[PDB]
Amino acid sequence: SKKILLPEPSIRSVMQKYLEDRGEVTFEKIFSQKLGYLLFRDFCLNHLEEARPLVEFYEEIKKYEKLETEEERVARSREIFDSYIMKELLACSHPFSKSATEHVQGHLGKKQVPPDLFQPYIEEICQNLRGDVFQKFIESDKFTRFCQWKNVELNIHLTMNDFSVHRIIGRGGFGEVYGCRKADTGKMYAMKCLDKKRIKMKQGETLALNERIMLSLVSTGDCPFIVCMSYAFHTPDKLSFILDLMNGGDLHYHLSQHGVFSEADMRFYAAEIILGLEHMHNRFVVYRDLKPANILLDEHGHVRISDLGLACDFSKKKPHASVGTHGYMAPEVLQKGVAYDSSADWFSLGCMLFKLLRGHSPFRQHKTKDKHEIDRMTLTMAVELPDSFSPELRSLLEGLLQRDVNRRLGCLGRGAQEVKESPFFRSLDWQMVFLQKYPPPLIPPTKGIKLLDSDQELYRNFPLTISERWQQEVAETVFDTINAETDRLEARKKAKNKHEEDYALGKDCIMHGYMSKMGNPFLTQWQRRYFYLFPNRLEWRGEGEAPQSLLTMEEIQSVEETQIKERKCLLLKIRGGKQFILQCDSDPELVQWKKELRDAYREAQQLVQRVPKMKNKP
Amino acid sequence: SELDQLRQEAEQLKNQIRDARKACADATLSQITNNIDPVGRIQMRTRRTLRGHLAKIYAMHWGTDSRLLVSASQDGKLIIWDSYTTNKVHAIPLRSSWVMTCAYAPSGNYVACGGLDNICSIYNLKTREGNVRVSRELAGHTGYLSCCRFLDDNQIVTSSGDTTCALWDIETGQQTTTFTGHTGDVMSLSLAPDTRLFVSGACDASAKLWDVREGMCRQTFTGHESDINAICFFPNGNAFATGSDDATCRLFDLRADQELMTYSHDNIICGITSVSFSKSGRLLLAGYDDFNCNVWDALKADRAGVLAGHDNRVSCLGVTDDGMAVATGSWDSFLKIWN
Amino acid sequence: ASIAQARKLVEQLKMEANIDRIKVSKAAADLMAYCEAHAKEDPLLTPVPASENPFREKKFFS
Ligand SMILES: CC1=C(C(=O)Nc2ccc3[nH]ncc3c2)[C@H](c2ccc(F)c(C(=O)NCc3nccc4ccccc34)c2)NC(=O)N1
Ligand SMILES: [Mg+2]
Q1: Nearest CB to B282; choose among C9, C27, C42
Q2: A/B interface, count of CB pairs below 8 Å
Q3: Ordered domains of chain A (ranges, CATH)
Q4: Distance from Cα A323 to the centre of ligand 2, integer Å
Q5: Which regions are annotated as WD repeats (chain B)?
Q6: By CB distance 3.0 to 4.6 Å, which of A31, A292, B209, C28 could disulfide with A252?
Q7: Contact C16 B219 (CB under 8 A)
Q8: How far is CA C31 from the centre of its chain?
Q9: Residue A193: CB within 6 Å of ligand 1?
C-alpha cells in the first residue's frame, strides 16, 4: 500500500506532451531539479562515453567549490587542471574557448585560487551539454524514468492518512503541532493543524492564509535556520502544514529551565538566528514576531525560526501597522501609518538577546503585565544596560536597540552583513556557523459554530507542494532503491514479450497511453484499455489483440470534466445522443487527454467539413 | 482590349460548339431503343459480407482476377480480401489516417492509395520475404488525392483536389504529365479500356476526356447541376456515365460529343457516390447516399433494381472484370458482394 | 486576370470545336449494338446457374 509505485513507461507518451506544452523540457529546466540532474548524470557517465568526461569534470569542479582552504584548493586545482584541462589539450580534444582555458591557466601559475576559478568552464560545459547531448538523453530512457517520477510529483494529493502521527509537541490558540513520519518515503516531519472552527470563531482567516504564503516565500533554498514547509493541505475541519521537525522545544521554555545565558552561549543562538533572518530578508520578508517562544531547538541543540504568520512581504508595499509581540516590537513598528521594512527584526533581535542574558525584555520592567507601559517606555526611553556586559557586547546591543532607523545596526544599507561583522562576533567563522559546526550551548533531554461553503472557497488554493523539497526528500531516501526495483519489474516484462511490435510506430499517432472507459456503471465495470489517439479516430485495445474498437473524431460533440464517485472523469458526448466516459490514472493525464481530444476533434471536424467525399450533406 | 476579345471569342466559340452538338440531335437514345425488350426486375442477393474495417469505408477496387479486391477505410487501413472466402490476405496499416482512395494494379503485384496526405503510395505485395513494403510515395500534388489507377506496374494516373490529374513513372516517382483544365476539386477518374484515354469528373460539374500520351483534354461534357462524385467508361470505350450530387446519373457519348440519357426519378433526391457498368454495359449500377445502390437499364433508363442492404451511405462499388459480381462499400464499415 | 490564360483557354476551345462529331442516332445505335452483342457473356443479365457462379452455395477454391 504505503510505498511509492511508479507508473509504467507507457506514461512517457503522455507526460512528454504535458511538459512540452509548458516549455518544461528545456535542458535548463531539467538540469536544475534534483531528480532530473540525477537521471541526466546517470545517463552521461554510464550510457554515453562522449559526455561522461564532461560531467565528471563538472562534478570534480563542483566539489572544489566546497573545499575549505586555499591549500586544499591549489592542491586540488592542479590535479583538476592536470587531469581534465591539460591532458585533453595534448590530444586536441578539448572543446572549450581559450579565453576560458587561459583564464584558468593564468591564475594557477600566479597562485590565486578563489572558489569561482572555473566559473567560465561551468558555463561552457553547460553549452556543450545543452541540446545535442541533451537530445540523445530525451531519446534515452533515462528521460522515460524522469517522466515517471514527474508524474508522481504532479499527482500528489495528501490527506492525514499519508502520515503516521505521533506526540503533540506544540500548542497555540488556533491548533496544535504533531510530530510524524510520512509513510510514502519514511521522512520525519512536524504537522501543524489549525482548526477552521477555532479560526472563524476568533476571526483569523487572514493571519492563517498568510502563514502559508509566507512559508512558500521561504521554503526554497534549504535554510538550516528556519522551520520550513514541504507541503500544505487540508480536510474539511483542519488546515495542515508539513514542517521541518524540531523536537528540542523552544527557547522561551528552555530559558526558564536554564535561566539566563552567558554571553558566549548567547552568541551561538544569535549567530544562527541572524543567518535565519538573512534568508528571510533576502526574500523580502519581515518576520516581526521575533522572540524566544518562536525559536525552537532540534535534538542536537541547533535552532531555527518558526511560525511566520506575522511575517509579511515588503517586496511591494511596506507595512505601517502595529503587529508584533509587545516588548519586542520596534519604535517605527509601534506608530500606526509609520511604515517599516526588514529594519524591524534587528530591533527585536536586540530585545530578544537582552532577554536571554537578563531574565526579561529590556522594556518589560517592574514585572509589568500592562502593555501601554512598554509601548511608551520603548518609544520615549533610551535603553540602559547592566555593566556586567562586556563592551563589544554593548557595541552590538547599542547598535541593535537604536530607536532611529538611520542609526540602527542592520538597517544601514548592507542588511545582515553589518551585524555579522560586529566585534561581538569576531571570534566566529560564519561558514562554520552555517554548516552548524559550532557546538551548541544547550542539549535538550466546545462550540456551536457552523462552516459555510463560502468558507471552503476561502481555503481553495491552499493545497501545495514545494517541488524542490519533495525531490530532495525523495532523493535522499528511496529514489535509488525505487529506480532499481522498477528497473527489475520493467526488465522482466520486456524480456518476456519475447507481442513485441509497437502499434504507434510508423504511423501518424498523436498520443497513446492507458485509461479506463466505463462499461455498465451499475456493475462498477471499468475496462482498462490502452488507447491511441490518431487525428481522426480514438482506437483502444485490451491484450493479445490489435485495436478492435474505436471512436471517430467526427462523431464527438463535446468533451467535459465530470466527477463520478467524486473521482474526476472525462465525459464525451457522442453524435447519436450517446455518452462515453474515461478515467485516467492521474491529474496530468486527464489535463492532457482533455486538451488533445479537444484539439483533435475540433480540427478534424473542421477539416472534414471541407472535403466533399467525407463531408455530410443535410 | 486583349482579354475582352479573348473572352468574346470563348463565348462565341462555346456557342459554336453548342450548335455543332445540336446538329447531331436528330434522335434520342430513348427513341432509338424504344423497341427493345426490358430487362425486367433484377434481383441480386448478398453472397458475401466483408467485416474487418473499424470505421467508414471510402473506396474499393477489384483485382483483375475478379477474386481479390482492396478496400480503404476511415480506420487508416487497406485490406485486400479474397472475395470468394472473406479472407484478409493483407491488412495494411497506413501512415496517414486520412486515406480516401485505393487501386489494385492490374498485375496483382502493387496497390496504391492516398488521401489528405496529398501523396499516392504504392504498396508492394510480395517482396524478398513476401512482406508488404511501401515502394514509393508519389508526392507532387498540392491537394488531396481523390482517385488513382494503375496503367501497368510502372505507370499510374491520379486525380486531386488541386483541380488536376497526373501521370507518374512509378520507378522514378516522377510526375510525367499533368492535366490542368478543371476549375474545381477533381473527384473520380476513369481509365478507358485501351488505356490511352481517360475521363475525369469534378466539382465544377464537368467531366473531361484526356489523352494520356498527349497530356491534353480532348473534350468537355457539362450539364450536371452540381459536383460529379463518380465516373466510369462504357465497356466499349465510347461513352461514360457520371454520377452527381444533383441526384442524377448521365450517360455521355464521346463521338456525338454529348449527353445521351439521364437517369433519375422524382422520388430520389439523395446524391450519387459511385457508378459502374455491368459487363455488356446494359446495366448502370449507381451507389446513392440513402444507403441503396440503384440498378439502371442503360439503354432505356428505367430503374431495374435496387441493392438495399447497407445502413449508411454507399461510398463505392464495382463490377468484376468477368462480370460475375458487384462489390459495395459503405459508411457502415462493410463491403458486400452480390449476384 | 492573365492574358496567357485567356489564350490557352481559347486554344482549348478551338481544339474541342474541331473534332468530327457523329449523328446521335449512329452512336446510340452502336451502343445498343454492343449491348446485344454481349448480353450472352454478362452474368448479371443472363443468370448463369450455381455451378458456374463462384459464390452461390460453393466452397471448393484453390
Ligand atoms: C513556534 C510556536 C509554536 C509551535 O510549537 N510551533 C511549531 C512549529 C513548527 C514546528 N516544527 N517542530 C516543532 C514545531 C513547532 C506554538 C504553536 C503551535 C501550534 C499552533 F497552532 C500555534 C498557533 O496557533 N499560534 C497562533 C496562530 N497560529 C496560526 C495562525 C493564527 C492566526 C491568528 C491568531 C493566532 C494564530 C502555536 N506556540 C508558539 O508560541 N510558537
Ligand atoms: Mg509602524
Answers
A1: C42
A2: 57
A3: 8-50+131-157+466-503 (1.10.287.1270), 51-130 (1.10.167.10), 158-247+448-465 (3.30.200.20), 248-447 (1.10.510.10), 504-610 (2.30.29.30)
A4: 8
A5: 45-93, 94-139, 140-180, 181-222, 223-266, 267-308, 309-339
A6: A292
A7: yes
A8: 9
A9: no
